[PDB]
Structures are given as structure tokens and as C-alpha cells.
Amino acid sequence: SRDLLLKAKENGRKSLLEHEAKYFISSYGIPVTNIRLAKSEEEAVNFSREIGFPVVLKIVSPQVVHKSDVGGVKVNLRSEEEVRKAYREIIENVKRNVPNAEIEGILVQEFAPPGVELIIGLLRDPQFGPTVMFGLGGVFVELFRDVSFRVAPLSEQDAESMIKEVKAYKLLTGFRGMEPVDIEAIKDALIRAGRIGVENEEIAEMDLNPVIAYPKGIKVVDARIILR
Amino acid sequence: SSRDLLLKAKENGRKSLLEHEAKYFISSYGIPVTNIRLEEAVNFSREIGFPVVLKIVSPQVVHKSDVGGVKVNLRSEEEVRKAYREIIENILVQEFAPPGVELIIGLLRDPQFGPTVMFGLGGVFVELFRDVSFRVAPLSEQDAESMIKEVKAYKLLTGFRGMEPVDIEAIKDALIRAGRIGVENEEIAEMDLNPVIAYPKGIKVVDARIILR
Amino acid sequence: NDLERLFNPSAIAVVGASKDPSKIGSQILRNLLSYGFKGKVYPINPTADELMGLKCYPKVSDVPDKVDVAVISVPSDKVLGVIDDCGKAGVKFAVVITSGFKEVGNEELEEELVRRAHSYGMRVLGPNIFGYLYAPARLNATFGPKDVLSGNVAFISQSGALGIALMGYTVVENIGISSIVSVGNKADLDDVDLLDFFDKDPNTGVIMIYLEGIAPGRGRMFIDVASRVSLRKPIIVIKAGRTEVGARAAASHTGSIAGSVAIYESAFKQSGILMAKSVEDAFDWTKALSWNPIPEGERLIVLTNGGGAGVQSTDTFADNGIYLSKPPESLIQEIKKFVPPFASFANPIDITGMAPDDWYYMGTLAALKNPDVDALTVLYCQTAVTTPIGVAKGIVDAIKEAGNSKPVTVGMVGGPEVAEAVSFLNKQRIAAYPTPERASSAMSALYAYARARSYVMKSLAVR
Amino acid sequence: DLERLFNPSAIAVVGASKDPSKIGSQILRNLLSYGFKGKVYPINPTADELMGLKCYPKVSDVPDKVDVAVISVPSDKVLGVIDDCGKAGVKFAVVITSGFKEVGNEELEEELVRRAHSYGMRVLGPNIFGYLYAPARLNATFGPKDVLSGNVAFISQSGALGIALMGYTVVENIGISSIVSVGNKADLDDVDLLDFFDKDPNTGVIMIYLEGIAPGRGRMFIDVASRVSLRKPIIVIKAGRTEVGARAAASHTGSIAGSVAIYESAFKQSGILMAKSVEDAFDWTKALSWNPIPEGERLIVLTNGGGAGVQSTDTFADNGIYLSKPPESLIQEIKKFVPPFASFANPIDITGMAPDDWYYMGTLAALKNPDVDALTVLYCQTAVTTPIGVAKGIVDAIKEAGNSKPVTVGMVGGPEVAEAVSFLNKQRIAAYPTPERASSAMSALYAYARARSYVMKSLAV
Numbered sequence A: 001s002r003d004l005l006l007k008a009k010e011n012g013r014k015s016l017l018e019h020e021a022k023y024f025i026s027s028y029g030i031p032v033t034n035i036r037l038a039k040s041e042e043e044a045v046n047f048s049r050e051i052g053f054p055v056v057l058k059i060v061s062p063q064v065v066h067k068s069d070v071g072g073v074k075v076n077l078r079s080e081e082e083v084r085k086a087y088r089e090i091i092e093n094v095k096r097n098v099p100n101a102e103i104e105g106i107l108v109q110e111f112a113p114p115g116v117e118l119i120i121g122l123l124r125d126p127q128f129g130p131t132v133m134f135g136l137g138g139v140f141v142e143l144f145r146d147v148s149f150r151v152a153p154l155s156e157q158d159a160e161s162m163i164k165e166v167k168a169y170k171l172l173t174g175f176r177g178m179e180p181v182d183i184e185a186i187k188d189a190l191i192r193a194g195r196i197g198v199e200n201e202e203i204a205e206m207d208l209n210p211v212i213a214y215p216k217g218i219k220v221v222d223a224r225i226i227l228r
Numbered sequence B: 001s002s003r004d005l006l007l008k009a010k011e012n013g014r015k016s017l018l019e020h021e022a023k024y025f026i027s028s029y030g031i032p033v034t035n036i037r038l039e040e041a042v043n044f045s046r047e048i049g050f051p052v053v054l055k056i057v058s059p060q061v062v063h064k065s066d067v068g069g070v071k072v073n074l075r076s077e078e079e080v081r082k083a084y085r086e087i088i089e090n091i092l093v094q095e096f097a098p099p100g101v102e103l104i105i106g107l108l109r110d111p112q113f114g115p116t117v118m119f120g121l122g123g124v125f126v127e128l129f130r131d132v133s134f135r136v137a138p139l140s141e142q143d144a145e146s147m148i149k150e151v152k153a154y155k156l157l158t159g160f161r162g163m164e165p166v167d168i169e170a171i172k173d174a175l176i177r178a179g180r181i182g183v184e185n186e187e188i189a190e191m192d193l194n195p196v197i198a199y200p201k202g203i204k205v206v207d208a209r210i211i212l213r
Numbered sequence C: 001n002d003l004e005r006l007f008n009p010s011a012i013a014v015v016g017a018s019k020d021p022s023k024i025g026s027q028i029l030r031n032l033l034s035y036g037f038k039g040k041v042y043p044i045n046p047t048a049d050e051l052m053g054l055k056c057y058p059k060v061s062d063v064p065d066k067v068d069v070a071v072i073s074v075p076s077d078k079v080l081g082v083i084d085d086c087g088k089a090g091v092k093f094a095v096v097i098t099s100g101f102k103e104v105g106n107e108e109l110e111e112e113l114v115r116r117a118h119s120y121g122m123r124v125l126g127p128n129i130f131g132y133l134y135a136p137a138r139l140n141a142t143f144g145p146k147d148v149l150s151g152n153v154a155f156i157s158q159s160g161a162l163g164i165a166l167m168g169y170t171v172v173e174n175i176g177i178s179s180i181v182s183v184g185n186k187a188d189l190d191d192v193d194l195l196d197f198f199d200k201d202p203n204t205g206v207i208m209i210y211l212e213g214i215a216p217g218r219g220r221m222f223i224d225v226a227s228r229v230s231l232r233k234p235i236i237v238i239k240a241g242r243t244e245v246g247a248r249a250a251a252s253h254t255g256s257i258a259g260s261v262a263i264y265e266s267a268f269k270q271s272g273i274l275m276a277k278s279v280e281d282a283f284d285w286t287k288a289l290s291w292n293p294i295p296e297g298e299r300l301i302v303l304t305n306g307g308g309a310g311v312q313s314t315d316t317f318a319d320n321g322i323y324l325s326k327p328p329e330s331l332i333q334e335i336k337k338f339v340p341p342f343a344s345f346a347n348p349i350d351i352t353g354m355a356p357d358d359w360y361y362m363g364t365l366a367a368l369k370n371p372d373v374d375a376l377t378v379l380y381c382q383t384a385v386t387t388p389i390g391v392a393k394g395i396v397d398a399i400k401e402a403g404n405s406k407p408v409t410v411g412m413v414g415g416p417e418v419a420e421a422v423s424f425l426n427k428q429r430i431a432a433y434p435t436p437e438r439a440s441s442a443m444s445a446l447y448a449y450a451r452a453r454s455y456v457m458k459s460l461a462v463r
Numbered sequence D: 001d002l003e004r005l006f007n008p009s010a011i012a013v014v015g016a017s018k019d020p021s022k023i024g025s026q027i028l029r030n031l032l033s034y035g036f037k038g039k040v041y042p043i044n045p046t047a048d049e050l051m052g053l054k055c056y057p058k059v060s061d062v063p064d065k066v067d068v069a070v071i072s073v074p075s076d077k078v079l080g081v082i083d084d085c086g087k088a089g090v091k092f093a094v095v096i097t098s099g100f101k102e103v104g105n106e107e108l109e110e111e112l113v114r115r116a117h118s119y120g121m122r123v124l125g126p127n128i129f130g131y132l133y134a135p136a137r138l139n140a141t142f143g144p145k146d147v148l149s150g151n152v153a154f155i156s157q158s159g160a161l162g163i164a165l166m167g168y169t170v171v172e173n174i175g176i177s178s179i180v181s182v183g184n185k186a187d188l189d190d191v192d193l194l195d196f197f198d199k200d201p202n203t204g205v206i207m208i209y210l211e212g213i214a215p216g217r218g219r220m221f222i223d224v225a226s227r228v229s230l231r232k233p234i235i236v237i238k239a240g241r242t243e244v245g246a247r248a249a250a251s252h253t254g255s256i257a258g259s260v261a262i263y264e265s266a267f268k269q270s271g272i273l274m275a276k277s278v279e280d281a282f283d284w285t286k287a288l289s290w291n292p293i294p295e296g297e298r299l300i301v302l303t304n305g306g307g308a309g310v311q312s313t314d315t316f317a318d319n320g321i322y323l324s325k326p327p328e329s330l331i332q333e334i335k336k337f338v339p340p341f342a343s344f345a346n347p348i349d350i351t352g353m354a355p356d357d358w359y360y361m362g363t364l365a366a367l368k369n370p371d372v373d374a375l376t377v378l379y380c381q382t383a384v385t386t387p388i389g390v391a392k393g394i395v396d397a398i399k400e401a402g403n404s405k406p407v408t409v410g411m412v413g414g415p416e417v418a419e420a421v422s423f424l425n426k427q428r429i430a431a432y433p434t435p436e437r438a439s440s441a442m443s444a445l446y447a448y449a450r451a452r453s454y455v456m457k458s459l460a461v
């Protein structure tokens, strides 16, 4: 819902939970991996079938910054039973590695096959305000810092030029004989990201990371929205 | 003499060395390589230790992965035997290299400076980022040490995202030795060590390519 | 709003002038008279009855005339007193020379200053500025140099010490000024307001801004205005402080890698602005932008008597994303009428070292007249066969006879005589430089501006 | 050994003529004009006297052992002269003549070198404008009559640009020890000349305009240039930096590697400073010529204006130099005369109202402080000051100091500042009309310090 930012702010929250961020992003027409928040093993299985296999499970705790490190993430679950295994394994994993940690729930989300990992950012600058960022995403975002910036709202020129300027742009036009990815989808995502910035003053920072680009369309795998 | 591999190749009008020959020749210079051997397959598979990798060795090996002539991560005799027969329709056994930082080490002939060594992050996205460095051989320890710190991706080698830092000294030694190969062997035109997996301790050449002239 | 009466006032009041000449107020008054201001000048001083032969009043309100501007050079303790007086006198603009405000911590006083000024419906320039100059109105309200060369360049500096020094430096580099404006603390009036004025000012054709930074919430407006301006007039910005602190370590990757520096660069790109990393670059580009029209196409020709200089040029152009194509056959033939057969036509067109002065005239002329040539960079290396001044007059004559306006830049290398020749050319408003790289960089600025303008046009393209 | 080339006792000028406009005659006039003390023997078939000197028709007719023969005759006549010089025992042939390999005639150039070697003599060029050596008052070129004396050695592969730059050194106050044109590089090249300038105590800096080196000569170039770099800075202006179309090779290495990237690496291994522009080359040369290398990274910037200080900092950062906090001793020492609202974050802003005296005191304080390794002084012209006054202050402060620390100066302003900069440069103090150029010059000093460090390590036993 568009008002999710409001509810978060009134609850003294400085950020949105992954599933909330994804709902909010989706309501602006940016494609996202279908996600649900399970609060029981049974709800998990149900949501797993409602989403379709294979699926991914993530713990939702405030005291767990790096989930993978505590074994709070299970990837590529293909069967109901495999899902139940993972559901319990994550819970017990978190309790052992971080007992104090409170549990909010388990996130079930569609599995995203491999592809060009991109990042789409949104930052509020004191001078220029809503600003959009683009570049190679994934885990190695900060390593190359191969990025571009544009002040919102973005024209088609702005979005198109900020894509061609990054060095990694070569990946998007077919590299190693690879099939070129959907650039128009990316442009649309960038323009819409800009709109989110302009219309939502309470957003300080936003991270669409990773954003998998395929030959046809794109998908936001993970999102992070920092409020102010 | 390792030179006999080069000589035999030349007399057979061969303008390049076969993967196992290249690995033997590289190993004789002190560069670590995944140990190789030439039913016969399974026997060497047990002699090398699991898991293993099998690649067809045909006169025309343009792009194996595309032809399905290679089977990866074989852990059991039975699983190995599947591929030995199965790839054919589409006897060289190779050690399996666990995941790690993929690097490239090159050697090229420049008209001006002659034998030149290249370094940088390898893998599939080598030429895309082109994050590489060059040094004219022979390489001092300073040369080898500096050309590593120069590449953007160097950060991967010092512990990134809590990842464990890799053995930098091993890489330096490999680079210096690579340079020596270039200087001492005039019949070598180009050489490609790609990928070269760097681990917390030591490194291993997974695949090698030696172009003769 | 409108700043016409700020740059073209009928009456100006110099508050802070004194019998003591060493005082800043007195320096401003002297510059005002020496530079030849046609309007009325009203020295304001408590005790002084006459200053510089002008009737001196103790307060602006005591002046029997509608004062448009008040230059204020009194201690920060006394500024507010003067602001109230200017208010009741109906003054439109307060140019506050005084220091000791936001820059030193006292932002409280600064906001107060602005509020009162706004209460009387009058704007504030500064505070912490060295004043401003406007040549078309023979107005020099600064304590900088007495004079500048007249021209179409407007220079807006956020920095005072560097601003005033550069004011003198424009003379050395033969840059013709239309206006010098110190904006200092930018309490009220800023670059946006000044950009609006210079957009309309037919006397100004190029704008150069030394920018330390802009006020929060002002950036969007800066882009909106600057992009519009950029379509007609080039804007060069010297961004002060362009070195990132690095590693922000925020609650997100975007927060952590995004830096204000990189955002300013993007904002400048979107505004069609050219960003200079150095004062020398800024001045080199300004000169070429002030004296040349933008190229209509990519058919740039380089003409050199030395292959070595030609290669330096090619490297420099390439660094700026400019690649030279084969010259048109019409031009090649036209040049082969006097050039030896062992000359080059790969572009740069090497006319060989032994080329006499006459060839520089013919080559330049042939190029300029050729309808398939959009731009021309002429490189010369001093040799005994030639005289620098001879080559210089040849180039000038060729430009006259061409009877058109195609962008030209000149690079000359050599000793004292070449230095004299470069000055000669620049004094005739022909962009000349003492090295091939600088000449090619200047030409690259013309193309950079063309590309900038094209960027804005595309983004404003009616879908 | 090229000692006989740069310090010859006797030199012949083949190709001189009654006609002054001819190149040989220009060379002869420069040889006399510049003040060569040795014997000069004009050589011409008919002329009996030239420039008041006994002219012979052949070198072998000269009653004296000639060390060097400058040859200015058409290509078709060059070989004959070479044979004559051979029979005369000449050690060096400086071939001005064009029309050899550079225009396709490889055969003639090859033969030229062969005969020259047959007599055991070396060849400079061909296709050069000559060479100059100030310590011997020797100007064997047809360029300008004179250059300022100093410790810089300039080697140009390009003729037109080489001669032009030779004149340009005067305008930029660069003191020259030697100008050498190498042209076609048929025999003697940059390697050989580097070897000589390595030993020559008259040369402290070496600048090279390089278009390229001969195949199979690069390794030798690195070996020599590294060793030279241990003691003397080498600046190179690499002509041809633009990468050509990527080759489609049989390997990733061949496909990625470019000649440009390799040249940059070769220069790195040699401890050579690569300049992308003539301007940069001259600025850096000047600073390297007149200053010792900094011993540490404690670099102080001293400015009367914050704006100039920011421009300095930005430029220093682009060259991988970052300013640290200045030592407390220096801060207090300076606080004795500056206002309290001054800055000490480095750049030490002594505020715009600073008069001339403060520049002497600040400069002196910094230079004597044992925790300061280098000083860049920036000045923005204000009515409070005179550029010349500030200049004299800096000069005096340096004299009083130990002259053991590098200093650069950046001044911004009008005609008076221009005069002040010229004044400072004429006293061998690296001054520039912008803060960016002064800071780039200082960065050149640190770049070379790091370059020498690189070489010292790589050659370390």
C-alpha cells in the first residue's frame, strides 16, 4: 500500500521490512519477486505453493544484520518437505547463534535465476533533492563503484544516458555472445524510481539491490528503504 | 627436458600445446597446477582423488561447454563412469578446484619490450572490466608486488565482505616465474593461465593455454 | 525578480567611505569615480562633509535622491543600523562588503540581516564580498583593480580572495569582461538570481562561475534555470572542493557510495554546464567560447607544420572524445596546389616544417572557405624559415577573407617572438595559446559545449 | 663513450656556404655566436673562407684531428662525405640531412650506418636539427642562437617541435645543459644518450620527447632508465597515447593488451614520469631542476586565500597526495602574528589581509620546522599587498632557510603578479601563475620521490 511509509513513520520506524518495501515498490509498477511473510511452518508451505517453486526463505529479525552469517537464509527449496526442513533449521539456527534475537517471521519469496545483477538507488541530496543512481549491482557494487547519478524527475534522455555512461554497460548489449538484456525495462524502472523519490518526501535512501536484468523484463530481488 | 614438449609440438606442425602438455611444462617451472593424468579414466581418478573433472581431448576443441564434452564435480566411480561414456556421443582426468578468487596471468610478446606479463581478475568477465596490469619481464619482486596492488579488484585479495584474504606471495612467485618462461623460451608467442584460483594458502592453475610460433 | 537597477543604477551610496584612504570604503569610492560611473555617487559618513569632491551625507535617508543601491563597508556591529536606514530610504539593493557573519559562525545575525532587508522589499548581495562590476554601465563597485578589459564574459565568484585576484588575471589572459560579481556568503541573492539576469543581458555572452556550493533546496531551481540559459549562452563552472571524503558508511549502499561531488557533476551535466578542474582550463575555454561560434558539425580540421605538434593535438582531442576524420578531398586537392607531395593529409594536415608564412595563409583560407569544414585548429612550431608574426598576420588575414564565422583556435610554440605573436592574436580576439595541447583543449571546449547544448535539447524534446 | 661528442676539441661543418640562408651556414653562425672555444672547420668545395675562418674542401684536408663532423649536404652526397670523414678518423657524424628511412629509403640509411661503422664511428640521426651542449659552449644546431644555462638535458625525436621547444625553454626560464635531436635514430638513440647523461655532472634532469623505440630495444631502455632514475629524474612526453583498435588475437592476453598500456608500465618500471602535455613537462622539469626531493609526506600549503587553498588541495588529491594536520610547533610559531580567526587545518590560511611581511615569516617558520618536508606557497593579489614585496619575502625566507626543502609558488593576479612570477623564476624558484600548476609541480617532486623508491626497491639486492 502507498501509505506503508506513513504507518512505518508513526511507529518510530527508521526503515521498511523487505516485504513491505517490495509491496511499496510494486505499487509503482516496478517488477518484484513475489514475496510473503510466514509466521508459521504451515503458512510457509501454503505461501510456497502460492508462489511456486523453487523458493527462498529469509529470517526477519532486528538483531540479525547479516543473515547468511547466522544461517538465516535458505536458497532453492523445491518441495514442501524441503521447505519445512529449512523453516525449522533457520529458526533453531538463529536461536543458537544469537539467542537474544527476537523473531518477527520468515519471508518466502520466488527464486530468481541468474542474470545481469544491477543496482538502482535513490538518495535525497540536501541541494538537489531526489537523485537516482544506476550501475552494476550484486555483491560487488562497492568494489567497482561503477555508477552514474541523475537528479529526478528523470527524462528519457537522463535515464538513457546514465545507462550508456557506466563502463559495465557492455553487459547489456550482449557480451561473450550472450543475449542482450531488456534496456527499456531498466529505463522505465529508473524513471519510476525517480517518481518514488519526488512523491515520497519521507524517503531518505533506497536500495534496489540486486535487480536482475533478463533478455525480457527485470526483477527486483531485494529492496531496502531508509526513512527519515 | 621440458623443452621436448615444445620441440615435439613444433615438428608436428602444432601451433599450440595440449592442455596436459601445457600443464606439465608450466609445472616444471614451479607454478602450481591441478595434477593431471593421461576404465583408464577411473583408475587415474582414484590416483588423483575426488572430486574430479573430465574433459574430452579432441583435435577440434573449440568450445567444450557448448558441446557438452566436459563433466564437472565427479565424486564417485559410478558417477565418473557415466561421463566417460556419455560425453563421447556428444582419457584425460583433472583435479577439481574448489571455488575461490579467479585470477588471470598472461604472457605476451611486444615488438618493443618483448616478454610481458599480464595480471588481473580472471573468470568469464576478464576482458569486460579489463582491470589488468602489465610488466615487462624479467619481473623483480617489486614489479610483481606493485602490478597486483594496481588493479581495481585487488580488494578481493585482502578480505572483502568478511571473505578470507588470499595468498599474495604465491601470486607474486607465479608472476615472476611466468616472466622467466617468457624470457627463456623464444618459441612461445602467447600464454594464458586462466583461471588461476587463489586460495587462503597457495594458488592453482585450473586451465592453461600456450600458443607457439 | 529584476536586477536591472542593481547593475544599471541611477544612484549609488557608499556607506563607510572615509577621509582615510586606506579604508576599504574609500577604495570602493575611488574605483567608482576612476572607472567613470555616470550616475550619482553619494558618500555616506557621520562626520565627513565632503569626500572625493562629492557632497557626503551622514545617512542614506538624508540623500535628496532616489538611491537604487547602497554599498555597505561598516563593521558587522553597525550593519543593521545601516540596513534600517536604507529601508526607509527605499533602497532596492544592499551590497554588504562586511565580514563576520555565517562564514565565521554568526548565522543568527545573517538571517536577521536578510529578514529586515526583505521587510523593506529590498534584496541583499553578500555579505562577505568584494563588491561587483558592470562594464556596460561603467560601474566598478569593488576594491579590486581600477579597470578590466571590456568584453562579453560575466564572472561570478563565491570566493573573495581568489575572485579579486582573478579579476586582475583576466587582464593578463586578455579576457574581456562584461561583469564581475562577488556573491560571498550567498545570504539572499545567489547564482540562480544572477543567472536569470545574465540570461537577458545582451552584453553578456559567456558566464563563468567559481562555485563552492549551493544552498539546500536550491539545486533543482539551479538546474532548471541553468539548462535554459545553457541553450543560448555557455556556462563554465569551477567547482571548488571536488575531492570526496569517501566511505560514508550509511544504512544503505546508495547512501555509502553516493557523494555530493559526483552529484554536482551530474547536476552540471543535466544543466548543460561545462565543469573545469582548474583556473587555467576555465580561462582557456572561456576565451574560445567568447570569441567563437559553436561548430555546426564534426568536420574539424587540424593544420600543422610539424608532425610532433600534430600528434600532441590528436592525443589531446582523443582525451576529450574527439576523433579526427579524413579531410574532404576538395580541401586536399586545394592544398596540394602549393604543398609538396611528401606532405600528409591524414588529418592533422601536415604541411611540413619548411612551410613558409604564405602557406599558413593559403591553408587556413582554403580550410575556412571549404563548405565541408566546420572548425579549424592551427598549430605552428617556430622555425628559422618563418616568422611568428608573419604566420600570425597570415591567419588573421585568412579569417577576414573567409568572410564567415567558423570556430578557430591557434597553438604556437617557440621563444619570445612566438610569445609576442600569441599576444598579438589574442588582442585581436583570436584564441591563441603557447602550446598545441592548450589550443586543442580550447577547441574541445567548443565541442563540449555543443554536446552539452544537445543534451539539454534532447531532454526537453517534445515527446 | 660520447665524451668526444659533447666535448669535442675540433668540429667540422660540411655544407656551409657563402649563402647565409643555407642550413649549414646557420649552424656555423650558431657555433661561433654561442662561443665555441675549440677549432671550427667550415667545409665547402669552392669557398676559401667562411665566417672569417679558413675553409677546406674536405675533412681529410684539415690539419687537425676532427672529433665531430656536422653534415648538411643532400642525401645523395652524404655517403661520399661519410667515406671522407672515415679516412680522416672522425669519431662522430651528425647527419642533419633528410630523405632516409622516414620517407621509405631504408636502404640508404642502412648503408649509411654500415660504412660509418666500418671506420669505427657513430652516427647521430639522420633527420635531426643537431645538438647543443652548454658546458662546452657548443651550439651545433640551426635553432635559436642561445639558451639559458642550467642542468636540464632535452632529447627530442621530433625535429619541428624539438626546435620550437628549444626556443620555448627561454620563455619558461628553463636552464639547459644540453639539447639533442635524435631524429631517425638510425644508430645512436635514447639509450646511449641516457647512459652519457647518467654520468654527466652538468645534467641533473632529463626530458625526452619520445615517439617510439626500435623493436628489441625496450628491455635495454628500462634497464638503463631505471638506473639513471636512481639519481636523476627522467620526464618523458610520450607522443601517441591514443590506443588503436583492439586486436583480435588467439588469447585473452593478446586481445586485451595494448601498446599504450605497456608503454605506461615500462615507464613505471623505469621510474619515469610521463607527461601528457608539453606544459606539464616544462612545469615539472622546472621544479625538479631547482629543488631536492622531499624526504617525507609532511607537506604544508600556505595561502592568504581559502579559494586558492581549495584548488591546491583538489589538485593534490588528483595526484594521490593528501595533506595532514600541521605540526603544533609550527601552528604556535605562526599564531604570534596572525589573527585568531585564521585557519590551521592545512592549507594554513593566513587570511586575505595578510601583508608582505607575513609571507616571509610564515615561509621561514615552515621551512625551519624540522617536521615540515615540503612547502607550497599560494598568493592571491590584494590591495593590501604588492606581488613583488611578497616575492622578495619568499626569496629571503628561502635564503635564510637551509635550501634543503622543496618549494613551489603559485601567484594569481594582474601584470604585477606576472612580473613577480618572472622574478621568482629568474632566481631558480619554481613559480607559476595558478595554484593548480604550483601544486602539480610539487606533485611532480613527490611522484619522482615515489618513482625513485620504486626503482630502489626493484633493483634492491
Ligand SMILES: CC(C)(COP(=O)(O)OP(=O)(O)OC[C@H]1O[C@@H](n2cnc3c(N)ncnc32)[C@H](O)[C@@H]1OP(=O)(O)O)[C@@H](O)C(=O)NCCC(=O)NCCS
Binding pocket: C015, C016, C017, C018, C019, C020, C023, C024, C025, C044, C045, C046, C047, C048, C058, C072, C073, C074, C075, C076, C078, C081, C082, C097, C098, C099, C100, C128, C129, C130, C159, C160, C161, D352
Ligand atoms: C567592513 C570593514 C571593511 C570595515 O572596517 P573599517 O573600515 O576599519 O571600519 P570602521 O571602523 O573604520 O568604520 C567604517 C567607516 O564608516 C563610518 N561609519 C560607521 N558606522 C556608520 C554608519 N552607520 N553610517 C555611516 N558611516 C558609518 C566610520 O566612522 C568609519 O569612518 P571614519 O573614518 O569616519 O571613522 C570590516 O569590518 C571588514 O568586514 N573587513 C573585511 C573585508 C573583507 O574581507 N570583505 C570581503 C572581501 S572578500
Ligand SMILES: CC(C)(COP(=O)(O)OP(=O)(O)OC[C@H]1O[C@@H](n2cnc3c(N)ncnc32)[C@H](O)[C@@H]1OP(=O)(O)O)[C@@H](O)C(=O)NCCC(=O)NCCS
Binding pocket: D014, D015, D016, D017, D018, D019, D022, D023, D024, D043, D044, D045, D046, D047, D057, D071, D072, D073, D074, D075, D077, D080, D081, D096, D097, D098, D099, D127, D128, D129, D158, D159, D160
Ligand atoms: C641537407 C640539406 C639541408 C642541404 O640543403 P642545401 O643547402 O640546399 O643543399 P646543397 O645542395 O645546396 O648543398 C649545401 C652546400 O654544400 C656543398 N657541398 C655539396 N657536396 C659537398 C661535399 N661533398 N663536401 C662539402 N660541401 C659539399 C654544396 O656546394 C653547397 O654549397 P654552395 O652553396 O657553396 O654551393 C637538404 O638536403 C635537406 O635535407 N634539407 C632539410 C633537412 C631537414 O629538414 N632536416 C631535419 C630538420 S628536423
Ligand SMILES: Nc1ncnc2c1ncn2[C@@H]1O[C@H](COP(=O)(O)OP(=O)(O)CP(=O)(O)O)[C@@H](O)[C@H]1O
Binding pocket: A033, A056, A066, A067, A068, A073, A075, A109, A110, A111, A112, A113, A139, A209, A210, A221, A222
Ligand atoms: N530471490 C532470490 N533468488 C536467488 N538467490 C537469492 C534470492 N534472494 C537471495 N538470494 C541469495 O541469497 C543470498 C543472501 O541474501 P541476503 O539478502 O541475505 O544478502 P545479500 O547477499 O543480498 C546482501 P544484503 O543482505 O545487504 O541484501 C544472496 O546473496 C543471494 O545469493
Ligand SMILES: Nc1ncnc2c1ncn2[C@@H]1O[C@H](COP(=O)(O)OP(=O)(O)CP(=O)(O)O)[C@@H](O)[C@H]1O
Binding pocket: B053, B064, B065, B070, B072, B094, B095, B096, B097, B098, B194, B206, B207
Ligand atoms: N577444474 C574445475 N574446477 C571448477 N570449475 C571448473 C573447472 N574446470 C572448468 N570449470 C568451470 O567450467 C567452465 C567451463 O569449462 P571450460 O574451461 O571448458 O570453458 P571456458 O569458460 O574456460 C572456455 P576456454 O577454455 O576457451 O577458456 C569454466 O568456465 C569454469 O567456470
Ligand SMILES: [Mg+2]
Binding pocket: A209, A210, A222
Ligand atoms: Mg539482499
Ligand SMILES: [Mg+2]
Binding pocket: B194, B195, B207
Ligand atoms: Mg578454461
Ligand SMILES: [Mg+2]
Binding pocket: C305, C306, C307, C352, C353, D160
Ligand atoms: Mg615535417
Ligand SMILES: [Mg+2]
Binding pocket: D009, D010, D039, D064, D065
Ligand atoms: Mg686539435
Ligand SMILES: [Mg+2]
Binding pocket: C161, D304, D305, D306, D349, D351, D352
Ligand atoms: Mg580567507
